Amino acid sequence: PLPKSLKYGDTIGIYSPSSPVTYTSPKRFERAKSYLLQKGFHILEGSLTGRYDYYRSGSIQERAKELNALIRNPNVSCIMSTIGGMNSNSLLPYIDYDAFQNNPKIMIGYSDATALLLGIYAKTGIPTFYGPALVPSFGEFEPFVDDTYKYFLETLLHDQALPYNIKQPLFWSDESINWEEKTKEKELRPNNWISVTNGQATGRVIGGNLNTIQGIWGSPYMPCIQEGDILFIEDSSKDAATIERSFSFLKINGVFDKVSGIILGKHEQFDDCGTNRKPYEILLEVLQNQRIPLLADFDCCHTHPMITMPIGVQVKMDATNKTIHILEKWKI
Amino acid sequence: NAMPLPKSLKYGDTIGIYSPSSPVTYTSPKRFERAKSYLLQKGFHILEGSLTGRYDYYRSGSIQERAKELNALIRNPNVSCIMSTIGGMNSNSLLPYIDYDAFQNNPKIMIGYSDATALLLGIYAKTGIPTFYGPALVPSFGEFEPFVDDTYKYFLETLLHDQALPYNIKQPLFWSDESINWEEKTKEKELRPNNWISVTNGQATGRVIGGNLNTIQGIWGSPYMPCIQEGDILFIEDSSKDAATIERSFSFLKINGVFDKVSGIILGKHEQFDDCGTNRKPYEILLEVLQNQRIPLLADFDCCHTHPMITMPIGVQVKMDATNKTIHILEKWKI
Ligand SMILES: Nc1ncnc2c1ncn2[C@@H]1O[C@H](COP(=O)(O)O)[C@@H](O)[C@H]1O
Ligand SMILES: Nc1ncnc2c1ncn2[C@@H]1O[C@H](COP(=O)(O)O)[C@@H](O)[C@H]1O
């Protein structure tokens, strides 16, 4: 049960399940739309576009109805979050899962939108996409926006023969600049994926933004983690204390006794609290010498550029050799 | 029916202290020395855990080092009460390494709050022995007069004094959440006239489960979180969070069916709440999450980060009267 590939000419429906970014960052919003329109995609603005309710776009009900309208719209190929936030999980009881299951569509975003990507996967079994959100990902200036775009086409639009190899970008940035307007130019940081623990795993990939997962854990909206799953996790803009708590949360729930491997994203603007420790090192301490293949600094996270990763499908990861391959169809 | 219970606390008892997360014994020495002195004066003895004075940036020590500190207190038969120095983020790291069997064969008063919730609930969930949402040494007993005396009174009344049941938990007359007077006193905190808030009318009776909501999201689903059962009274508090964060947490409960099981909610005050401009109160955000579901709710309960602090047993039957703003403990928490 799979969504149709994106085509030029298709309509991307956009919704704001948490922060009211289309209100507070209008320039980046307009740039992001223009970028996609120039590429050849239409943008249907969700009913809360341009609305402001302080920390959020609107009420729980109104946010549900904004997304639902998109889900129920036959004219919309792809559904994309404008931005993350804290509050996607509020929507979960009210989403029209059956409407989605009866007419599957591409569901894309990241960060707080993990609540919905995972919820829709758990309820319908249809793969969803950890990938660009319209404002942060496509409002980005050159050069990085073009790399993210290349990855978005690779996953959603291109014919891809299986296995589909996910390649590492040459450069990245987590630099906190050029939000609304460009001033200076982002440092090209030279890229590497890190072989933290050597080895290989294949199995169904599950995860997204770990902080956000903690807001849906235990519910019907969190897909049950199974023996042999590959855990994919990322966090942004947290400190060492926060990610230790999240790693231990995983440990004590028995997650690391089930997963065959771990893909850890880069951590945008990580605050190491003076320790000079890297996020994977904190994870290693939690793992206590449990030998799970661990590939870190994967470029599907809040750093630019961003890969678009299908969730809920068979993946093969080789930590030693730093490869990610998607083994099963995630689209039509 | 009857169940294991920790011995009441007695004057002269040793209180074991440990730092399962933030290194407050290093970073706030004057509050720490003053908190020690406050309890020493009252007649108690403090046994300082192996990581007292130590500094590992955001934490007191490594996971293993911190498990070691707490386990030595648990195994020490001369310790009557085990009290965290302060919270943080990282208590939940210790849970796979705690000696639950030794706690269980010499149960002690386990007390603290905030991040220590992972430990308080972890020990209850593993051993069935009630633990206590109450003072942590540094924030609670390092508090300057007058509030520290109120906190101390509740601590004594609940843990040392003999109490007939039902045990009425009196509303504190005054409170503050002001952030002054941490290491040293620059002026008097405001004595704010206090009130509990009858958010939604009605009564509930059942086992009280909860603590620091944010912390609970660190242990949720694990063997260390007790399963919420039909009839429970949920007790929750948070501190120094914004509206976005709490809505997430409330939604987290909602989507887990928690509000379908609980007979009532006790919500603590929220220290230094950031409403993000909405002018909304934390219970107003909870209520939206509740939607059309009616649940008796008593809010601004003084078992939280605000001063002063009530000591509340966890895992025991309570009656909460939201309409009349009363809380009674209905079954023994100590012997
Ligand atoms: N006001 C801002 N200034 C600069 N970057 C921002 C701002 N708001 C959001 N962002 C960026 O976009 C991300 C928003 O992602 P999230 O809120 O986690 O979906 C942040 O981590 C930043 O990378
Ligand atoms: N530097 C400080 N200034 C004022 N209050 C503090 C300071 N450090 C800790 N606190 C108080 O100590 C409480 C305990 O922290 P925690 O147990 O981590 O939630 C915090 O909520 C504050 O009430």
CSV table of N, CA, C and O in Angstrom, one decimal, chain A residues 53-56 59-61 63 85-87 89-90 92-94 112 211-212 214-221 240-242 244-245 248-249 251-253 273-275 277 282 285-286 288, chain B residues 56-59 62-64 66 88-90 92-93 95-97 115 214-215 217-224 243-245 247-248 251-252 254-256 276-278 280 285 288-289 291:
chain,number,residue,atom,x,y,z
A,53,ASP,N,-1.3,32.0,16.4
A,53,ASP,CA,-1.8,31.9,17.8
A,53,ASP,C,-0.6,31.7,18.7
A,53,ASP,O,-0.4,30.7,19.4
A,54,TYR,N,0.3,32.7,18.6
A,54,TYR,CA,1.5,32.8,19.6
A,54,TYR,C,2.4,31.7,19.3
A,54,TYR,O,3.1,31.6,18.3
A,55,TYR,N,2.5,30.7,20.2
A,55,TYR,CA,3.3,29.5,19.9
A,55,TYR,C,2.8,28.5,18.8
A,55,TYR,O,3.5,27.6,18.4
A,56,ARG,N,1.6,28.7,18.4
A,56,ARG,CA,1.1,27.7,17.5
A,56,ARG,C,0.2,28.5,16.4
A,56,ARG,O,-0.2,29.6,16.6
A,59,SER,N,-6.0,26.4,17.2
A,59,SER,CA,-6.5,25.4,18.1
A,59,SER,C,-6.2,24.0,17.7
A,59,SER,O,-5.8,23.9,16.5
A,60,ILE,N,-6.3,23.1,18.6
A,60,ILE,CA,-6.1,21.6,18.3
A,60,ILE,C,-7.1,21.3,17.1
A,60,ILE,O,-6.7,20.7,16.1
A,61,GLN,N,-8.3,21.7,17.3
A,61,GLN,CA,-9.4,21.3,16.3
A,61,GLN,C,-9.1,22.0,14.9
A,61,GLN,O,-9.1,21.3,13.9
A,63,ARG,N,-6.2,22.9,13.7
A,63,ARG,CA,-5.0,22.3,13.1
A,63,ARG,C,-5.3,20.9,12.5
A,63,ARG,O,-4.8,20.5,11.5
A,85,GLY,N,8.0,22.4,15.6
A,85,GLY,CA,7.4,23.0,16.8
A,85,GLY,C,7.4,22.0,17.9
A,85,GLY,O,8.3,21.2,18.1
A,86,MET,N,6.3,22.1,18.7
A,86,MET,CA,6.1,21.1,19.8
A,86,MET,C,4.9,20.3,19.7
A,86,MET,O,4.7,19.3,20.3
A,87,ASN,N,3.9,20.8,18.9
A,87,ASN,CA,2.5,20.5,19.1
A,87,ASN,C,1.8,19.6,18.1
A,87,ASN,O,0.6,19.6,18.1
A,89,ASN,N,1.6,16.4,18.0
A,89,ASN,CA,1.0,15.3,18.6
A,89,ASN,C,-0.4,15.5,19.1
A,89,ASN,O,-1.2,14.6,19.2
A,90,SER,N,-0.8,16.8,19.3
A,90,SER,CA,-2.1,17.1,19.7
A,90,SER,C,-3.1,16.7,18.6
A,90,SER,O,-4.3,16.3,18.9
A,92,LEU,N,-3.3,14.1,16.8
A,92,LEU,CA,-3.3,12.7,16.4
A,92,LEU,C,-4.6,12.0,16.6
A,92,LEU,O,-5.0,11.2,15.7
A,93,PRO,N,-5.4,12.3,17.6
A,93,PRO,CA,-6.7,11.7,17.8
A,93,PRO,C,-7.7,12.0,16.7
A,93,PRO,O,-8.6,11.3,16.4
A,94,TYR,N,-7.5,13.2,16.0
A,94,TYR,CA,-8.5,13.7,15.1
A,94,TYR,C,-8.2,13.6,13.6
A,94,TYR,O,-9.0,14.0,12.8
A,112,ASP,N,9.3,18.2,14.8
A,112,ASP,CA,8.0,17.9,15.5
A,112,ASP,C,7.0,17.1,14.6
A,112,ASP,O,6.2,16.3,15.0
A,211,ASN,N,13.4,13.6,20.3
A,211,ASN,CA,12.7,14.4,21.4
A,211,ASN,C,11.2,14.2,21.1
A,211,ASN,O,10.4,14.0,22.0
A,212,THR,N,10.8,14.3,19.9
A,212,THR,CA,9.4,14.3,19.5
A,212,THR,C,8.8,12.9,19.7
A,212,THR,O,7.6,12.8,20.1
A,214,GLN,N,9.3,11.0,22.1
A,214,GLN,CA,8.9,10.9,23.5
A,214,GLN,C,7.5,11.5,23.8
A,214,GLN,O,7.0,11.3,24.9
A,215,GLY,N,7.0,12.3,22.9
A,215,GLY,CA,5.6,12.8,23.0
A,215,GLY,C,4.6,11.9,22.5
A,215,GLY,O,3.4,12.2,22.7
A,216,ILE,N,5.0,10.8,21.8
A,216,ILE,CA,4.0,9.8,21.3
A,216,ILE,C,4.2,8.4,21.8
A,216,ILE,O,3.4,7.5,21.5
A,217,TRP,N,5.3,8.2,22.4
A,217,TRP,CA,5.7,6.9,22.9
A,217,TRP,C,4.6,6.2,23.7
A,217,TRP,O,3.9,6.9,24.5
A,218,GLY,N,4.4,5.0,23.4
A,218,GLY,CA,3.4,4.2,24.1
A,218,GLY,C,2.0,4.2,23.6
A,218,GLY,O,1.1,3.4,24.0
A,219,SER,N,1.7,5.2,22.7
A,219,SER,CA,0.4,5.4,22.2
A,219,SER,C,0.1,4.5,21.0
A,219,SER,O,1.1,4.0,20.4
A,220,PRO,N,-1.1,4.5,20.5
A,220,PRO,CA,-1.4,3.8,19.2
A,220,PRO,C,-0.8,4.5,18.0
A,220,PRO,O,-0.8,4.0,16.9
A,221,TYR,N,-0.2,5.7,18.2
A,221,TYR,CA,0.4,6.5,17.1
A,221,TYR,C,1.9,6.2,17.0
A,221,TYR,O,2.5,6.8,16.1
A,240,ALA,N,23.6,18.2,26.2
A,240,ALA,CA,24.0,16.9,26.5
A,240,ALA,C,23.2,16.2,27.5
A,240,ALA,O,23.0,15.0,27.5
A,241,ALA,N,22.6,17.0,28.5
A,241,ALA,CA,21.7,16.5,29.5
A,241,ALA,C,20.5,15.9,28.8
A,241,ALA,O,20.0,14.8,29.1
A,242,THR,N,19.8,16.7,28.0
A,242,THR,CA,18.6,16.3,27.2
A,242,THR,C,18.9,15.1,26.4
A,242,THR,O,18.1,14.1,26.5
A,244,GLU,N,21.2,12.8,26.8
A,244,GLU,CA,21.4,11.6,27.6
A,244,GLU,C,20.1,11.0,28.1
A,244,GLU,O,19.9,9.8,28.1
A,245,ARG,N,19.1,11.9,28.5
A,245,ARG,CA,17.8,11.5,29.0
A,245,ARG,C,17.1,10.7,27.9
A,245,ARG,O,16.5,9.7,28.1
A,248,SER,N,18.8,7.3,27.3
A,248,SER,CA,18.5,6.4,28.4
A,248,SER,C,17.0,5.9,28.3
A,248,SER,O,16.7,4.9,28.7
A,249,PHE,N,16.1,6.8,27.8
A,249,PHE,CA,14.7,6.5,27.7
A,249,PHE,C,14.6,5.4,26.8
A,249,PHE,O,13.8,4.5,27.0
A,251,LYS,N,17.1,3.1,26.1
A,251,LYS,CA,17.7,2.0,26.8
A,251,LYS,C,16.7,1.2,27.7
A,251,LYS,O,16.5,0.0,27.5
A,252,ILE,N,16.1,2.0,28.6
A,252,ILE,CA,15.2,1.4,29.6
A,252,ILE,C,13.9,0.8,29.0
A,252,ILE,O,13.2,0.1,29.7
A,253,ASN,N,13.5,1.2,27.8
A,253,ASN,CA,12.4,0.7,27.1
A,253,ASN,C,12.8,-0.6,26.4
A,253,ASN,O,11.9,-1.1,25.7
A,273,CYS,N,27.7,21.3,26.8
A,273,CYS,CA,27.8,21.7,28.2
A,273,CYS,C,29.2,21.8,28.8
A,273,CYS,O,29.4,21.6,30.0
A,274,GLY,N,30.2,22.0,27.9
A,274,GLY,CA,31.6,22.1,28.4
A,274,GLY,C,32.3,20.7,28.3
A,274,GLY,O,33.5,20.7,28.6
A,275,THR,N,31.6,19.7,28.0
A,275,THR,CA,32.2,18.3,28.1
A,275,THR,C,33.1,18.0,27.0
A,275,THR,O,33.9,17.1,27.1
A,277,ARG,N,32.0,16.4,24.6
A,277,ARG,CA,31.6,15.1,24.1
A,277,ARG,C,30.7,15.2,22.9
A,277,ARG,O,29.9,16.2,22.8
A,282,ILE,N,27.8,10.1,24.0
A,282,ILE,CA,26.8,9.9,25.1
A,282,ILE,C,26.0,8.7,24.9
A,282,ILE,O,25.8,7.9,25.8
A,285,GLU,N,27.9,5.8,25.9
A,285,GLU,CA,28.0,5.5,27.3
A,285,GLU,C,26.7,4.7,27.8
A,285,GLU,O,26.7,3.8,28.5
A,286,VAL,N,25.6,5.2,27.3
A,286,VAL,CA,24.3,4.6,27.6
A,286,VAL,C,24.3,3.1,27.1
A,286,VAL,O,23.8,2.2,27.8
A,288,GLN,N,26.7,1.0,27.0
A,288,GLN,CA,27.5,0.1,27.8
A,288,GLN,C,28.1,-1.0,27.1
A,288,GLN,O,28.0,-2.2,27.5
B,56,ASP,N,31.0,16.9,36.9
B,56,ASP,CA,31.1,16.4,35.5
B,56,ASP,C,30.2,17.3,34.6
B,56,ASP,O,29.5,16.8,33.8
B,57,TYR,N,30.3,18.6,34.8
B,57,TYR,CA,29.6,19.6,33.9
B,57,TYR,C,28.1,19.6,34.1
B,57,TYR,O,27.6,20.2,35.1
B,58,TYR,N,27.4,18.9,33.3
B,58,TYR,CA,25.9,18.9,33.5
B,58,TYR,C,25.5,17.8,34.5
B,58,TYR,O,24.3,17.8,34.9
B,59,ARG,N,26.4,16.9,34.8
B,59,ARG,CA,26.1,15.9,35.7
B,59,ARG,C,27.1,15.8,36.8
B,59,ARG,O,28.1,16.4,36.7
B,62,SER,N,29.5,9.8,36.0
B,62,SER,CA,29.0,8.9,35.0
B,62,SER,C,27.8,8.2,35.4
B,62,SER,O,27.5,8.2,36.6
B,63,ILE,N,27.2,7.5,34.4
B,63,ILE,CA,26.0,6.7,34.8
B,63,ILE,C,26.4,5.7,35.9
B,63,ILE,O,25.7,5.6,36.9
B,64,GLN,N,27.5,4.9,35.7
B,64,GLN,CA,27.8,4.0,36.6
B,64,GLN,C,28.2,4.6,38.0
B,64,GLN,O,27.8,4.0,39.0
B,66,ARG,N,27.0,7.2,39.3
B,66,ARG,CA,25.8,7.7,39.9
B,66,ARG,C,25.0,6.6,40.5
B,66,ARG,O,24.4,6.7,41.6
B,88,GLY,N,17.4,17.7,37.6
B,88,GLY,CA,18.2,17.8,36.4
B,88,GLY,C,17.5,17.1,35.3
B,88,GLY,O,16.4,17.4,35.0
B,89,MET,N,18.2,16.3,34.5
B,89,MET,CA,17.6,15.5,33.4
B,89,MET,C,17.9,14.0,33.5
B,89,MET,O,17.2,13.3,32.8
B,90,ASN,N,18.9,13.6,34.2
B,90,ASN,CA,19.5,12.3,34.0
B,90,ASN,C,19.3,11.2,34.9
B,90,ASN,O,20.0,10.2,34.8
B,92,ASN,N,17.0,9.0,35.0
B,92,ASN,CA,16.5,7.9,34.3
B,92,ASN,C,17.6,7.0,33.9
B,92,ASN,O,17.5,5.8,33.6
B,93,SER,N,18.8,7.5,33.8
B,93,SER,CA,20.0,6.7,33.4
B,93,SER,C,20.4,5.6,34.4
B,93,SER,O,20.9,4.5,34.0
B,95,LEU,N,18.4,3.7,36.1
B,95,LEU,CA,17.4,2.7,36.4
B,95,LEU,C,17.7,1.3,36.2
B,95,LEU,O,17.2,0.4,37.0
B,96,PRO,N,18.4,0.9,35.1
B,96,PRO,CA,18.8,-0.5,34.9
B,96,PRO,C,19.8,-1.0,36.0
B,96,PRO,O,20.0,-2.2,36.1
B,97,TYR,N,20.4,-0.1,36.7
B,97,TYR,CA,21.6,-0.4,37.6
B,97,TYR,C,21.3,-0.3,39.1
B,97,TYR,O,22.1,-0.6,39.9
B,115,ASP,N,13.3,15.9,38.3
B,115,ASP,CA,14.0,14.8,37.6
B,115,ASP,C,14.0,13.5,38.5
B,115,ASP,O,14.0,12.4,38.0
B,214,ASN,N,7.2,16.2,32.6
B,214,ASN,CA,8.3,16.1,31.7
B,214,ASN,C,9.2,15.0,31.9
B,214,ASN,O,9.7,14.4,31.0
B,215,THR,N,9.5,14.7,33.2
B,215,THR,CA,10.4,13.5,33.6
B,215,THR,C,9.8,12.2,33.3
B,215,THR,O,10.5,11.3,32.8
B,217,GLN,N,8.0,11.5,30.8
B,217,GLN,CA,8.2,11.2,29.4
B,217,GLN,C,9.6,10.6,29.1
B,217,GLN,O,9.8,9.9,28.0
B,218,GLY,N,10.5,10.6,30.1
B,218,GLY,CA,11.7,9.8,30.0
B,218,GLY,C,11.7,8.3,30.4
B,218,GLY,O,12.6,7.6,30.2
B,219,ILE,N,10.6,7.9,31.1
B,219,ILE,CA,10.6,6.5,31.6
B,219,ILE,C,9.4,5.8,31.1
B,219,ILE,O,9.2,4.6,31.3
B,220,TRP,N,8.5,6.5,30.4
B,220,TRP,CA,7.3,6.0,29.9
B,220,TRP,C,7.4,4.8,29.1
B,220,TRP,O,8.3,4.7,28.2
B,221,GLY,N,6.5,3.9,29.3
B,221,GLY,CA,6.7,2.6,28.6
B,221,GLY,C,7.6,1.5,29.1
B,221,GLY,O,7.6,0.4,28.7
B,222,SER,N,8.5,1.9,30.0
B,222,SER,CA,9.5,1.1,30.5
B,222,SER,C,9.0,0.3,31.7
B,222,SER,O,8.0,0.6,32.3
B,223,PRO,N,9.8,-0.7,32.2
B,223,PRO,CA,9.5,-1.4,33.4
B,223,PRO,C,9.5,-0.5,34.7
B,223,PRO,O,9.0,-0.9,35.7
B,224,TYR,N,10.1,0.7,34.5
B,224,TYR,CA,10.2,1.6,35.6
B,224,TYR,C,9.1,2.7,35.8
B,224,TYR,O,9.1,3.5,36.7
B,243,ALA,N,4.2,27.2,27.1
B,243,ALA,CA,3.0,26.6,26.8
B,243,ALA,C,3.1,25.5,25.8
B,243,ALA,O,2.4,24.5,25.8
B,244,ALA,N,4.0,25.7,24.8
B,244,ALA,CA,4.1,24.7,23.8
B,244,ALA,C,4.6,23.4,24.4
B,244,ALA,O,4.0,22.3,24.0
B,245,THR,N,5.5,23.4,25.3
B,245,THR,CA,6.0,22.2,25.9
B,245,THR,C,4.9,21.4,26.7
B,245,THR,O,4.8,20.2,26.5
B,247,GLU,N,1.6,21.6,26.4
B,247,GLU,CA,0.6,21.1,25.5
B,247,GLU,C,1.1,19.8,25.0
B,247,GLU,O,0.4,18.8,24.9
B,248,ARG,N,2.4,19.7,24.6
B,248,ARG,CA,2.9,18.4,24.1
B,248,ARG,C,2.8,17.3,25.2
B,248,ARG,O,2.4,16.2,24.8
B,251,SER,N,-0.9,16.4,25.7
B,251,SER,CA,-1.3,15.6,24.5
B,251,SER,C,-0.7,14.2,24.6
B,251,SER,O,-1.3,13.3,24.2
B,252,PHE,N,0.5,14.1,25.1
B,252,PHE,CA,1.2,12.8,25.3
B,252,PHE,C,0.3,11.9,26.2
B,252,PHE,O,0.2,10.8,25.8
B,254,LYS,N,-3.0,12.2,26.8
B,254,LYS,CA,-4.2,12.1,26.1
B,254,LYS,C,-4.1,10.9,25.0
B,254,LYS,O,-4.9,10.0,25.1
B,255,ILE,N,-3.1,10.9,24.2
B,255,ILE,CA,-3.0,10.0,23.2
B,255,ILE,C,-2.6,8.6,23.8
B,255,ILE,O,-2.7,7.6,23.1
B,256,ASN,N,-2.1,8.5,25.0
B,256,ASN,CA,-1.9,7.3,25.7
B,256,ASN,C,-3.1,6.8,26.4
B,256,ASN,O,-2.9,5.8,27.2
B,276,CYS,N,4.0,32.2,26.6
B,276,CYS,CA,4.3,32.5,25.2
B,276,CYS,C,3.4,33.6,24.7
B,276,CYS,O,3.0,33.7,23.5
B,277,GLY,N,2.9,34.5,25.6
B,277,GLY,CA,2.1,35.6,25.1
B,277,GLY,C,0.6,35.3,25.1
B,277,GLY,O,-0.2,36.2,24.9
B,278,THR,N,0.2,34.0,25.4
B,278,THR,CA,-1.2,33.7,25.3
B,278,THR,C,-2.1,34.1,26.4
B,278,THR,O,-3.3,34.2,26.3
B,280,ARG,N,-2.6,32.3,28.9
B,280,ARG,CA,-3.2,31.1,29.3
B,280,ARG,C,-2.6,30.5,30.5
B,280,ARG,O,-1.4,30.7,30.7
B,285,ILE,N,-4.7,25.1,29.1
B,285,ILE,CA,-4.1,24.3,28.0
B,285,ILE,C,-4.4,22.8,28.2
B,285,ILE,O,-4.9,22.1,27.3
B,288,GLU,N,-8.1,22.3,27.1
B,288,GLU,CA,-8.3,22.1,25.7
B,288,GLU,C,-7.9,20.7,25.3
B,288,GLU,O,-8.7,20.1,24.5
B,289,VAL,N,-6.8,20.3,25.7
B,289,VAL,CA,-6.4,18.9,25.4
B,289,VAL,C,-7.5,17.9,25.9
B,289,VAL,O,-7.8,16.9,25.1
B,291,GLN,N,-10.6,18.5,25.9
B,291,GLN,CA,-11.8,18.6,25.0
B,291,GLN,C,-13.1,18.4,25.8
B,291,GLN,O,-13.3,19.1,26.8
